DNA sequence: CGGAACAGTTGCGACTTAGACGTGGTTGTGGGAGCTGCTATACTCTCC
DNA sequence: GGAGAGTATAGGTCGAGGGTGTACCACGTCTAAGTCGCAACTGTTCC
RNA sequence: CCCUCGA
């Protein structure tokens, strides 16, 4: 997200990695968009230098008011008249831009959300050799995948013919398209003649000539229309070779470059397919099915001819949050461009300023539609800080641009040798989503092109140095990497002459130490954050280790936390980075401390105060409660933990308690995974947790009238109303059991809905009051607690409500839950069970 | 109570339990009310009626331009409807008129 | 071909032409022709002929005409079966059927409006094609071409989708249903239980038995009328518990754990009022239910009529099925701790 | 209603069948008016054809009572009866042009193809207006 | 009841009205999760599919021309009579020629010029059950199916009593293929129930048919109840076909009784049990 | 005039395959693109006499298309949203019934309401039969005094006296 | 425990309205997103 | 006639908690809300 | 329906 904004932090890190003249995510969208020209070239509009204003509201404000955490976006829009030479430079407000919080989340309509990184296939060229034909003979396929554009497929037939499919269009001899590109039937025989299958295909080609080829191509695309020569050639030009409707990214360009060896001189100029790329693709495929192991192309050098692994992480890419948001920005921005063009013809020049041309509605709407409707924009899972932390580290294969759940085979869900140090092989769901969702490894990074890197130690002349290099999956296959468990002495020399390593395409071998390139920077390098927290993980089978990683994120925050006696050392760094703990940004002395806030006086004389989240409801109903761990007068340092969070104790993740355990059958109550507990854990509240429910109710307009929230509930005893206030809303601090009224509400009832008996009494007693039904909000069955909060929004006031809704009331109930028979306990090793008896 | 749960009931060969689950415990609209009425009065459980989901099935079939009829042994079809007077007669009888 | 000779023949496209070919179709002639080809013919043409005669002979019987394969009128399903509900936030939700019907109505009405304006033949034919496509989508969507999609590119669910599939009417709403007088909870081990008994939480048993309790404490002085009994049970007044103990005696219940792989996945037990919110399962039946006690939950069903109670006591009682119905071997048998103990 | 059910029969429903089932034609795309929250007349939810949404209440409101059971409002055409009829009452649409029932065309094998001895690709070209078909020729006149 | 024998659950003779097909299906399906060949083989057997790794079988006694060259196997059989020579088309070299005991000979592998009996397997592997049906007759296919099916469960440590698999296999051949219609109106090639086939044969037998083996899916969709078949598979297809044929469901099935809310014709729902009349004896009424 | 029809079929129809590709851009759905192009052609043919013979037809038709899409677009934007759903969730049904005039009634509620109300019945029994009939008609069935008098064969004044007196009687009887 | 006489209320029935709301016309360009990363099996069509 | 290809079908059960609206103007056409009178209609009040 | 999760 810092790259999207073009943050100064990103700039410095960009200068550190070296500067390509780095452009932010927004900057790139603005520069590709500019200039916006009239179709006559008479006028132009250009954008530059985007800036973000201050945030509209603080985070907890948006959470309370159902707002979106956002900042106004400003751009400098310069309009130029190509005739008069007059220039108009203006400042335009582009919208309220949803902002990433300090915790790496977004607040959309008050609810906190996470954008999961998406696993997709990078643009490029991928060759697939299928031997599964019924003839038992091997076939060879290829796909050309761009970032945005039209699909192009070449297939050598089971009948021995080279086919072409364009955006699912039906096959034609590969020569048909090549001819239609301006190729003679003879010139194909010059380059492609070495292929006996291409020789057989040109005779099976039904027609020759560029006019008949281009005409046959335009027929395949449009079912019922007329062909035209200049229309079809400009159509084929704009379908592939033009930048507007077809875009290979720089990733796709380089991948095609490296895969075909076309440009060695590293030109960065343009990313689009080329005629030489089509020729190179067919030539690569031609030699492939023949069985050649290498190919050299005119102006190209020594590329192996081989199939590509679809699941390899050099061919598989990660679209991060900044890139997803950038894509939406590009869509809505292109819409705004369309509006500006339509507005250039209508308006009177010198009566136009940019702000009259610029309509920002489709941009804001484009952003809103993403966070609302996208599978990647997700309700944040906060059971405890660990469930929320890994959620932000999730790598998801499902979504737009990804694969459908229906179309995901068992080969996508398997651990892959390119995952090592990149995606954790352990942490992943055990349900239907197994293998479709994964966790970033502890030391992994996402490189600027979307590929995941892992650090390694340079091994020079059999010595293990401290020089660190981040390698991608492709770079890792060229070298020999020793596992971390490989012993080394004080000197860099290996202890053993033979060491088990991964060398080529994920094979494990006893290997000479003499030739070793790199070595793992540590154990746990291949493992996620939650998996790195399992003590003695190496002694647990991968299945129970999976169960352990998922079960830690299901732990409820206890009324009091306790750190484990036995950790892995990951618990502290996990709690701090998760961000549910309060940390001092600057070193100083504690000037004042209470349960409400902590203020630190820096040596500057400037002070900084940290407000405490107190009994806050998480998305899943657990209790987010922060407590200060520091005292007045204490000296603290930058990075030190000031206050504990829900599952933290002294800054280390505490997901449970240390219990005294005996391993033995006891009188059948622990039979088959059932667990027996001491009633001490009930009496001393060691397993007790706080759970906060949100009950919502609104009065709206109905067929027979408007609903009213009231304390006047027909035929209801005054005794049961005793805890309601004067509005009909239950009073703060009341103890509510199932069936008790939280909020009284009445709804208009028609005459026909009265019982004959109810009709008689109302008539003879002269009751003229409105006929109503009791719609009051009541506590659901099996619920109890104390009322800890109330929010009311009225149409009488300026509170913004949906159409037809007069009043909206939320009631928050908090319950203390003692551990009990039927609750589920687990250890970190996958060992689970219900409590069968408490004794 | 799903498909496999019904297989178990059939495997036990318990007909009345399976019929009771799929009519007066779920679908049958007059039966579900008459059953509760019988328990409160301490009487025997009434005989089940027709499940609503079958009438719904017939209607979805007609909407496919399939003409489906439930035929008696006579060979003539059977209208599926309820007399609307029984509820009004009981309500009028409850007031003494 | 119409400009000249147009008075010597008639031709059309669309379904009106197919309706014409059917109207002019001689059924008996084509049937006897097919039978001749089956008799005196051989090879693949004999197969084609037979397969055709299945259809034609099917239509040969009276009361059944091929004309029904072309519709001049499309039926509309009652609205309760395709309802429309208001949502929090002032928005609405409709069944896909309403949107499909809406497309049919819009294209039919536009076809009328084009017929009245004397529109060019190509446009009227376009509207007829679109009407045919929309009635296609309404009946079976996606069966031909690409499906009509609502918001999110989700293809709408046609009238064929109601019947078929695991979520269809047959499988979900007919061969199975949700039922009254049922509950569920997590199961814990019942080691103190006899084989024919199961632990039932107090609140579960009070809800499931609510009418029986109500009548019983109405008969006793506790409740003045049945409605006072209802309100008295909903508040859990202390008088109910004793009464509950009385109404539950020798009244069996059904316990079920999913998936049900065989009939022992449902067994009948005598309920015992038990403290806590968990269902207590006898240790010996865990083989039949495959209950792991790692958080497994089970469901409870209450037999009502004399026949249902009798079936539970006799047919389904836990201690009346000890043996595996597959291999005849013993099923409720010591295992795990018990075995070790012995 | 007990088990007197003997057989259950299907047939093709003729247009006459469909119009006999129907309680009225649905002529309008509108569903319900937002302000009134009441079903638009001659629409998919129309009370006149499908029945009243509230027990014993017609659309105009002239009759709200059981006293009127069985009568049809002169103004709105709704019938005073139970809303239960809204689950048993069907409508219909009269088509400006004939339409094939896709079960009998696109299903494999194509029933229309076997009935008329037509290729399903050709049948498709006809039904979807990509090809003309000859309904009749005059043999005598052409010969003369 | 007597042909079925003991009820494994009660240990006694099976009661009249016990639904033993559902019990058989549950008994076969419940262990299915434990089968790691394997469960796909149980499917391949129950659906009567031509097996992969097909093993040819001899049609008639005679002499064998064994070509078997250039990574290919080809088997011609010249019958002992003047009949035409049957030729098996393609047999891959990955298959093994069967080792067996040749009649009037020793135990050895199949060789060129050998003499073979009628039902001899030409190769080692899975036999096409349809071939063993049309050659060795139905009572042999019963043996082959029950043994090959039970074999998979035995290998996995699961014991199913043979009688369940026998129930399913019984349902697998109820029918005959119509060859010559005769005077009997039966369309040739259709699959007609054996009882109905023998009943429709009236000289005052013209209908010719041969026993069929049909998988459980095809046998299920072939039931006389369009209501039962519509709720199983291919609902669109079944409903179109049933509408065109003006089929009338008789409602006698138990799944149909479930749908319409009628007591299933099994167990306590049988006419024998449900119509029982209960009366107290005179001596008891006295007291 | 038939001149407009022929000239329309020669000039306008070849533009369809163009205009349709435009309609897509607005709808991004093929069905709504078809409907849009068709309504556009309705407007164009109906209004083709207003088009100037030599002027460019493509821009004219394009503007008709856009404007039609906007009429439809603002029209849909004024209405509250209708979301097509494959299935209406049970949560949606209950949530909707919380605001309903009549909620989701259990079989228990239906069975209890159907039971006789004893107090009311016995109180009505104490009334004289005439007062009972009249008060019944009026206060339950809702008859007017005219119709009640027509049914009971008495003057309307009798209906008034019996209504008042039976009502006060029930008031003293039931409290 | 009636039948007029007499005096309070809904309630239907008109009409003015002010605004949402749909209609006139409609004239320089201008052709969508999304995907395709499922397996296995039976059988009609259709190209030959 | 006869073979490939193209299209059709199927793919576990039961539970818990969550879930969305870029785009022409300048106007006449209609409607969505009314305040307001007589009948028509409810009620007392008697003799 | 979809997301995600339990057996
Ligand atoms: Zn009316």
Distance (Å) from CA D83 to C1' H19? 32
Neighbours of A383 (CB within 10 A): 22
Contact list in C for residue E164 (CB cut-off 8 A) is 326
Neighbours of A23 (CB within 10 A): 15
C93-118 burial code (b ≥16 CB/10 A, e <16):
bbbbbbbbbbbbbbbbbbbbbbeeee
Contacts of A49 (CB under 8 A, 6+ apart): A75, A76
Phi-psi region of A18 (alpha: psi -120 to 50; beta: other; left: phi over 0): left
CB contact under 8 A, F88 and C211: no
Phi-psi region of C155 (alpha: psi -120 to 50; beta: other; left: phi over 0): beta
CA A126/CA A497 separation, integer angstroms? 39
Contacts of A316 (CB under 8 A, 6+ apart): A119, A120, A121, A122, A310, A418
Contact list in D for residue B55 (CB cut-off 8 A) is 88
Q: Which of A585, A337, F109 minimizes the C-alpha distance to B36?
A: F109
CA C210/CA B20 separation, integer angstroms? 18
Give the DSSP letter of residue F127.
Answer: S
Q: Which of A341, A1, D129 minimizes the C-alpha distance to C16?
A: D129
Contact list in C for residue F13 (CB cut-off 8 A) is 120, 122
CA A490/CA C93 separation, integer angstroms? 70
Helix (H, G, I), strand (E, B) or coil at C330: strand
Contacts of B50 (CB under 8 A, 6+ apart): B23, B28, B80, D1, E260, E261
Spacing of C-alpha A489 from chain mean position: 42
Cβ of residue F29 near strand G, that is under 7 Å?
A: yes
CA C95/CA C150 separation, integer angstroms? 11
Side-chain-side CA neighbours of residue D77 (13 Å): 9
- Rounded to 10 deg, the angle between the C27-40 and C44-60 helix axes is 150
To the nearest whole Å, the CA of B34 is away from the closest chain E CA by: 17
Token pair 């500067």 is found at A19
CA C330/CA C318 separation, integer angstroms? 13
- Going across the sheet that includes A675-677, the strands are A675-677, A832-838, A824-826
DSSP symbols for C137-177: HHHSSSSSSSPPB-GGGPBPP-HHHHHSSTTSIIIIIIS--
C292 is in an annotated binding site: yes
CA A330/CA C120 separation, integer angstroms? 42
Give the DSSP letter of residue A456.
Answer: E
Write the burial class of residue D127 (CB in 10 Å: 0-12 exposed, 13-18 middle, 19+ buried). Answer: buried
CA A292/CA A284 separation, integer angstroms? 9
Here the contacts of F140-145 (C-beta below 8 Å, separation 24 or greater) are F140/A756, F140/A759, F140/A760, F140/B95, F141/D65, F141/D66, F141/D67, F142/D65, F142/D67, F143/D67
Q: Which of A373, A376, A369 minimizes the C-alpha distance to A328?
A: A369
CA F87/CA C83 separation, integer angstroms? 10
CA F16/CA F23 separation, integer angstroms? 10
CA A26/CA A322 separation, integer angstroms? 10
CA A472/CA A453 separation, integer angstroms? 5
Cβ of residue F40 near strand G, that is under 7 Å?
A: no
Rg, Å, chain E Cα set: 25
Token pair 């519509």 is found at E230
- Cβ-contact E91, E123 below 8 angstroms: yes
Tokens of A86: 């007059």
- C-alpha angle B19-B23-B25 in degrees, rounded to nearest 5: 100
Of B50, B62, B72, the CB nearest to D13: B62
- Cβ-contact C103, C96 below 8 angstroms: no
* CATH code of the domain containing A163: 3.90.1110.10
Tokens of E152: 């998979």
- Cα distances from C165 to residues B57, C173, E236, in angstroms, run 14, 11, 11
Helix (H, G, I), strand (E, B) or coil at C244: helix
CA B18/CA E260 separation, integer angstroms? 12
Entry field: residues in chain B: 97
Token pair 């147009």 is found at C6
Q: Which domain holds residue A291?
A: 121-318
Give the DSSP letter of residue A634.
Answer: -
- Cβ-contact D89, C40 below 8 angstroms: no
Distance (Å) from CA F146 to C1' H39? 15
| Contact residues, E window 172-191, toward C, CB-based 8 Å cutoff | 187-189
Q: Which of D57, D22, D51, D28 minimizes the C-alpha distance to D41?
A: D28
To the nearest whole Å, the CA of F73 is away from the closest chain D CA by: 16
Stated as kind and residue range, the H or E segment containing F18 is helix F16-27
- Going across the sheet that includes A394-396, the strands are A316-319, A117-121, A394-396, A437-439
Both ends of chain E: CA-CA distance in Å? 40
CA A424/CA A450 separation, integer angstroms? 17
CA A106/CA A392 separation, integer angstroms? 11
Contact list in D for residue A752 (CB cut-off 8 A) is 54-57, 64-66
CB contact under 8 A, C132 and D26: no
- Rounded to 10 deg, the angle between the C306-314 and B15-22 helix axes is 130
CA A827/CA A659 separation, integer angstroms? 11
CA E234/CA E225 separation, integer angstroms? 14
CA B47/CA B59 separation, integer angstroms? 25
CA D87/CA D51 separation, integer angstroms? 9
- Cβ-contact E256, E228 below 8 angstroms: yes
Distance (Å) from CA A688 to C1' G14? 72
CA F129/CA F162 separation, integer angstroms? 10
CA E98/CA E88 separation, integer angstroms? 15
Tokens of A162: 């080279």
DSSP symbols for A308-343: --TTSTTTEEEE-HHHHHHHHHHHHHHHHHHHHHHH
C296 is in an annotated binding site: yes
CA F50/CA F168 separation, integer angstroms? 77
Stated as kind and residue range, the H or E segment containing B12 is helix B3-12
Tokens of E247: 């089929």
Q: Which of A366, A367, A358, A364 minimizes the C-alpha distance to A337?
A: A358
Stated as kind and residue range, the H or E segment containing D92 is strand D90-100
Write the burial class of residue A612 (CB in 10 Å: 0-12 exposed, 13-18 middle, 19+ buried). Answer: middle
- Cβ-contact A48, A354 below 8 angstroms: no
Residue A611: beta bridge partners? Answer: A597
Q: Is B43 on the interface with F (CB under 8 A)?
A: no
Q: Which of D102, D100, D96, D98 minimizes the C-alpha distance to D27?
A: D96
To the nearest whole Å, the CA of C67 is away from the closest chain F CA by: 29
Entry field: residues in chain D: 144
CA F85/CA F96 separation, integer angstroms? 15
Asked if the bond preceding A35 is cis, omega within 30° of 0, the reply is: yes
Distance (Å) from CA D37 to C1' G19? 21
- Cβ-contact E169, E145 below 8 angstroms: yes
To the nearest whole Å, the CA of B29 is away from the closest chain E CA by: 13
CA E228/CA E206 separation, integer angstroms? 32
Entry field: residues in chain A: 839
CA A154/CA A174 separation, integer angstroms? 7
CA E240/CA D103 separation, integer angstroms? 6
Chain F: which residues have CB within 8 Å of chain D? 79-80, 82, 101, 141-143
Q: Say how many Å lie between the CA of residue D76 and the centre of ligand 1.
A: 4
- Report the structure determination method: X-ray
Tokens of A542: 């991968």
Neighbours of A663 (CB within 10 A): 5
CA C173/CA B51 separation, integer angstroms? 10
- Cβ-contact F159, F149 below 8 angstroms: yes
DSSP symbols for chain E: -TTT-B-TTTSSBPPTT--HHHHHHHHHHGGGGG----HHHHHHHHTTPPPSSEE-B-SSSEEEEE---SS-EEEEEEESSSPPPEEEEEE-TTSEEPEEE-TTS-EEE--TT-EE-TT-BSEESEE-HHHHHHHH-HHHHHHHHHHHHHHHHHHTT----HHHHHHHHHHH--EEEES--TTS-PPTT-EEEHHHHHHS--------EEE----HHHHHHTSS-HHHHHTTS-HHHHHHHHHHTT-EE---SHHHHHHHT---SSGGGSHHHHT------HHHHH-
Asked if the bond preceding B14 is cis, omega within 30° of 0, the reply is: no
- Cα distances from A244 to residues A240, A334, F60, in angstroms, run 9, 11, 26
CA A458/CA A472 separation, integer angstroms? 15
- Cα distances from A770 to residues B24, F101, F138, in angstroms, run 37, 13, 19
Nearest protein residue to the C1' atom of H25, measured from CA:
F67
Helix (H, G, I), strand (E, B) or coil at A794: strand
Residue A224 has φ and ψ, to the nearest 5°, of -110, 10
Nearest protein residue to the C1' atom of G31, measured from CA:
F21
Side-chain-side CA neighbours of residue A686 (13 Å): 15
- Cβ-contact F125, F169 below 8 angstroms: no
- Cβ-contact E89, E74 below 8 angstroms: yes
Q: Which of C64, C97, C81, C138 minimizes the C-alpha distance to D13?
A: C64
CB contact under 8 A, C83 and F80: no
Give the DSSP letter of residue D57.
Answer: B
Contacts of A308 (CB under 8 A, 6+ apart): A125, A126, A127, A128, A259, A315
Tokens of A311: 């699941």
Spacing of C-alpha E204 from chain mean position: 33
């Amino acid at each position: 997200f810092e790259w999207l904004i073009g943050s100064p932090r990103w700039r410095e890190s960009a200068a550190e990695r070296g500067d390509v003249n780095p452009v932010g995510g927004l900057e790139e969208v603005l520069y590709e968009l500019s200039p916006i020209e009239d179709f006559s070239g008479s006028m132009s509009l250009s954008f530059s230098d985007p800036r973000f204003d201050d945030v509209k509201a603080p985070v907890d404000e948006c959470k309370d008011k159902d707002m979106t955490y956002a900042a106004p976006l400003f751009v400098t829009a310069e309009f130029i008249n190509n005739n008069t030479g007059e220039i108009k430079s203006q400042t335009v407000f582009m919208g309220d831009f949803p902002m990433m919080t300090e915790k790496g989340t977004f607040i959309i309509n008050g609810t906190e959300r996470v954008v999961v990184s998406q696993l997709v296939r990078s643009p490029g060229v991928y060759f697939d050799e299928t031997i599964d034909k019924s003839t038992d003979k091997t076939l060879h396929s290829v796909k050309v995948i761009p970032s945005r554009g039209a699909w192009l497929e070449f297939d050598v037939d089971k009948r021995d013919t080279v086919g072409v499919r364009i955006d699912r269009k039906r096959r034609q001899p590969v020569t048909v398209l090549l001819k239609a590109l301006g190729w003679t039937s003879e010139q194909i025989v010059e380059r492609f003649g070495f292929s006996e299958i291409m020789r057989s295909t040109l005779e099976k080609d039904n027609t020759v000539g560029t006019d008949e080829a281009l005409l046959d191509i335009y027929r395949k695309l449009r079912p019922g229309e007329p062909p035209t020569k200049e229309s079809a050639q400009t159509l084929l030009e704009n379908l592939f070779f033009k930048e507007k409707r077809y875009d290979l990214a720089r990733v796709g360009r380089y991948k095609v470059n490296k895969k075909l060896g076309l440009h060695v001189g590293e030109p960065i100029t343009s990313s689009t397919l080329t005629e030489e790329d089509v020729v190179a693709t067919i030539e690569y495929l031609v030699r492939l099915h023949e069985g050649q192991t290498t190919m050299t192309v005119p102006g190209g050098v020594e590329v192996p001819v081989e199939t590509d692994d679809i699941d390899h992480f050099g061919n598989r890419r990660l679209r991060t949050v900044g890139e997803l948001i950038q894509n939406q920005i590009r869509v809505g921005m292109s819409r705004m461009e369309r509006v500006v063009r339509e507005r250039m013809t209508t308006q009177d020049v010198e009566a136009i300023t940019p702000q009259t041309l610029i309509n920002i509605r489709p941009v804001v709407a484009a952003i809103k539609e993403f966070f609302g409707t996208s599978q990647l924009s997700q309700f944040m899972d906060q059971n405890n800080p660990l469930s929320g932390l890994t959620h932000k580290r999730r790598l998801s294969a499902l979504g737009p641009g990804g694969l459908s759940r229906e179309r995901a085979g068992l080969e996508v869900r398997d651990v892959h040798p390119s995952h090592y140090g990149r995606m954790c092989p352990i942490e992943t769901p055990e349900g239907p989503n197994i293998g479709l969702i994964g966790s970033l490894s502890v030391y992994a990074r996402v490189n600027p092109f979307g590929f995941i890197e892992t650090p390694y130690r340079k091994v020079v002349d059999g010595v293990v140095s401290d020089e660190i290099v981040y390698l991608t999956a492709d770079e890792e296959d060229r070298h020999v990497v020793a596992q971390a468990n490989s012993p080394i002495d004080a000197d860099g020399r290996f202890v053993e002459p033979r060491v088990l390593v991964r060398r080529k395409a994920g094979e494990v071998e006893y290997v000479p130490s003499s030739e070793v390139d790199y070595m793992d920077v540590s154990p746990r390098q291949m493992v996620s954050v939650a998996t790195a927290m399992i003590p003695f993980l190496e002694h647990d089978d991968a299945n129970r280790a999976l169960m352990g990683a998922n079960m830690q994120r299901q732990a409820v925050p206890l009324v009091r936390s306790e750190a484990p006696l036995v950790g892995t050392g990951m618990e502290l760094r996990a709690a701090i980075d998760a961000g549910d703990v309060v940390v001092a940004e600057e070193s100083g002395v504690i000037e004042e401390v209470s349960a409400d806030y902590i203020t630190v006086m820096h040596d500057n004389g400037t002070r900084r105060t940290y407000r405490m989240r107190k009994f806050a409801r998480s998305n899943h109903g657990t209790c987010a409660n922060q407590c200060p761990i520091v005292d007045a007068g204490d000296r603290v340092e930058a990075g030190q933990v000031i206050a504990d969070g829900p599952c933290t104790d002294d800054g280390e993740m505490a997901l449970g308690k240390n219990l005294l355990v005996a391993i033995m059958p006891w009188e059948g109550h622990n039979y088959e995974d059932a667990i027996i507990l001491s009633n001490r854990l009930v009496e001393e509240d060691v397993l007790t947790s706080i759970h906060i429910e949100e009950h919502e109710i609104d009065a709206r307009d109905t067929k027979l009238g408007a609903e009213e929230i009231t304390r006047d509930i027909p035929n209801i005893s005054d005794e049961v109303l005793a805890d309601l206030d004067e509005r009909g809303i239950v009073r703060i601090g009341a103890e509510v059991r199932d069936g008790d009224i939280l909020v009284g509400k009445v709804t208009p009832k028609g005459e026909t809905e009265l019982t004959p008996e109810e009709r008689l009494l109302r008539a003879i007693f002269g009751e003229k009051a409105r006929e109503v039904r009791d719609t009051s909000l009541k506590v659901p069955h099996g619920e109890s607690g104390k009322v800890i909060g109330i929010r009311v929004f009225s149409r009488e006031d300026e509170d913004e409500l949906p159409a037809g809704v007069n009043e909206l009331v939320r009631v928050y109930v908090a319950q203390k839950r003692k551990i009990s028979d039927g609750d589920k306990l687990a250890g970190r090793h996958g060992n689970k069970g219900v409590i069968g008896k408490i004794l | 109570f799903g498909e496999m749960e019904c297989w178990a009931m059939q495997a036990y060969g318990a007909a009345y339990t399976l019929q009771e689950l799929l009519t007066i415990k779920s679908d049958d609209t007059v039966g579900r009310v008459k059953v509760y009425e019988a328990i409160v009065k301490g009487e025997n459980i009434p005989e089940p009626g027709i499940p609503e989901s079958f009438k719904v099935l017939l209607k979805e079939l007609q909407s496919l331009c399939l003409n489906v009829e439930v035929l008696s042994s006579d060979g003539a079809a059977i209208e599926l409807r309820e007399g609307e007077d029984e509820d009004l007669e009981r309500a009028a009888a409850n007031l003494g008129i | 071909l119409v400009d000249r000779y147009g008075e010597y023949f008639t031709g059309a496209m669309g379904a009106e032409s197919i309706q014409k070919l059917i109207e002019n179709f001689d059924i008996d002639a084509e049937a006897e022709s097919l039978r001749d080809v089956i008799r005196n013919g051989k090879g693949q043409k004999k197969l084609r002929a037979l397969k055709r005669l299945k259809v034609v002979a099917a239509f040969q019987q009276s009361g059944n005409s091929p004309m029904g394969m072309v519709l001049d009128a499309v039926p509309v399903i009652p609205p309760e079966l395709r309802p429309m509900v208001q949502l929090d936030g002032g928005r609405f939700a409709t069944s896909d059927l309403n949107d499909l019907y809406r497309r049919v109505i819009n294209r039919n009405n536009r076809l009328k409006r084009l017929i009245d304006l004397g529109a060019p033949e190509i446009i009227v034919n376009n509207e007829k094609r679109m009407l045919q496509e929309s009635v296609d989508a309404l009946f079976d969507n996606g069966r031909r071409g690409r499906p009509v999609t609502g918001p999110g590119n989700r293809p709408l669910k046609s009238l064929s989708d109601l019947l078929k599939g695991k979520q269809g009417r047959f499988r979900q709403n007919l061969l199975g249903k949700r039922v009254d007088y049922s509950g569920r909870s997590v199961i814990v081990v019942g080691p103190q239980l006899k084989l024919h008994q199961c632990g039932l939480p107090k609140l579960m048993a009070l809800e499931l038995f609510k009418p029986f309790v109500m009548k019983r404490l109405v008969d006793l002085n506790h409740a003045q009328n049945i409605k006072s009994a209802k309100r008295m049970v909903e508040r859990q007044r202390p008088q109910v518990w004793d009464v509950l103990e009385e109404v539950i005696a020798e009244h069996p219940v059904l316990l079920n754990r999913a998936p049900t792989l065989h009939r022992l996945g449902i067994q009948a037990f005598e309920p015992m009022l038990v403290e806590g919110k968990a269902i207590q399962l006898h240790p010996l039946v865990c083989e039949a239910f495959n209950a792991d006690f790692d958080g497994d939950q089970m469901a409870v069903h209450l037999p009502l009529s004399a026949e249902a109670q009798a079936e539970a006591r006799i047919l389904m009682l836990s201690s009346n099925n000890i043996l595996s119905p597959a291999s005849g071997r013993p099923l409720a048998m010591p295992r795990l701790d018990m075995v070790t103990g012995l | 209603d007990v088990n007197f059910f003997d057989e259950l029969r299907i047939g093709l429903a003729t247009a006459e069948d469909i119009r006999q089932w129907s309680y009225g034609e649905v002529k309008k795309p509108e569903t319900i008016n937002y302000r009134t929250l009441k079903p638009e007349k001659d629409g998919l939810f129309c009370e006149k054809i499908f029945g009243p949404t509230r027990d014993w209440e017609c659309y105009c409101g002239k009759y709200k009572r059981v006293r009127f059971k069985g009568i049809i409002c002169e103004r709105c055409g709704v019938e005073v009866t139970r809303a239960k009829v809204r689950r048993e009452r069907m409508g219909h649409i009269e088509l400006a042009a004939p339409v094939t029932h896709i079960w009998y065309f696109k299903g494999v094998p194509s029933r229309l193809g076997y009935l008329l001895d037509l290729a399903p690709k050709d049948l498709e070209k006809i039904i979807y207006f990509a090809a003309y078909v000859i309904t009749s020729v005059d043999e005598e006149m052409r010969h003369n | 009841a007597t042909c079925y024998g003991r009820s494994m659950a009660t240990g006694k003779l099976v009661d009249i009205g016990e639904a033993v097909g559902i019990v058989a299906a549950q008994s076969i399906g419940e262990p299915g999760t434990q089968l790691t060949g394997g469960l796909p083989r149980v499917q391949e057997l129950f659906e009567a599919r031509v097996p992969r790794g097909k093993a040819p079988i001899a049609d008639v006694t005679g002499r064998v021309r064994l070509e078997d060259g250039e990574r290919f196997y080809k088997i011609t059989i010249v019958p002992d009579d003047g009949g035409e020579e049957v030729v098996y088309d393609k047999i891959s070299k990955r298959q093994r020629l069967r080792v067996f005991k040749h009649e009037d000979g020793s135990e050895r592998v199949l060789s060129d010029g050998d003499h073979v009996e009628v039902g001899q397997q030409l190769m080692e592997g899975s036999a096409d059950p349809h071939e063993v049906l049309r050659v060795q007759g139905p009572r042999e296919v019963q043996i082959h199916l029950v043994r090959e099916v039970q074999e998979v469960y035995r290998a996995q440590g699961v014991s199913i009593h043979d009688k369940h698999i026998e129930v399913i296999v019984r349902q697998m051949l109820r029918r005959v293929t119509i060859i010559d219609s005769g005077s009997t109106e039966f369309l040739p090639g259709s699959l007609i129930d054996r009882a109905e086939f023998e009943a429709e044969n009236r000289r005052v037998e013209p209908a010719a048919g041969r026993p069929v083996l049909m998988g459980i899916t095809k046998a299920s969709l072939a039931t006389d109840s369009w209501l039962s078949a519509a709720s199983f598979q291919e609902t669109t297809r079944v409903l179109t076909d049933a509408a065109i044929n003006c089929r009338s469901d008789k409602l006698n099935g138990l799944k149909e009784n479930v749908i319409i809310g009628k007591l299933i014709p099994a167990g306590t729902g049988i006419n024998r049990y449900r119509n029982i009349a209960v009366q107290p004896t005179e001596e008891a009424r006295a007291a | 005039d038939e001149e407009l029809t022929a000239r329309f079929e020669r000039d306008a129809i070849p533009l369809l395959d163009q205009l349709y590709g435009g309609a897509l851009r607005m709808t991004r759905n093929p069905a709504d693109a078809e409907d849009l192009l068709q309504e556009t052609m309705v407007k164009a043919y109906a209004g083709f006499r207003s088009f100037r013979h030599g002027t460019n037809l493509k821009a004219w038709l394009y503007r008709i298309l856009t404007n039609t899409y906007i009429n439809s677009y603002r029209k849909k934007q004024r209405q509250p949203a209708e979301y097509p759903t494959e299935q209406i969730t049970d949560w949606q049904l209950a949530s909707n019934a919380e605001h309903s005039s009549t909620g989701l009634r259990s079989a228990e509620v239906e069975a209890l309401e159907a039971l006789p109300d004893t107090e009311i019945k016995e109180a009505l029994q104490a009334l004289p039969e005439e007062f009972r009939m009249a008060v019944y008609y009026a206060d339950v069935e809702g008859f007017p005094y005219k119709e009640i008098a027509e049914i009971m064969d008495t003057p309307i004044g009798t209906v008034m006296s019996r209504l008042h007196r039976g009502r006060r009687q029930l008031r003293g009887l039931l409290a």
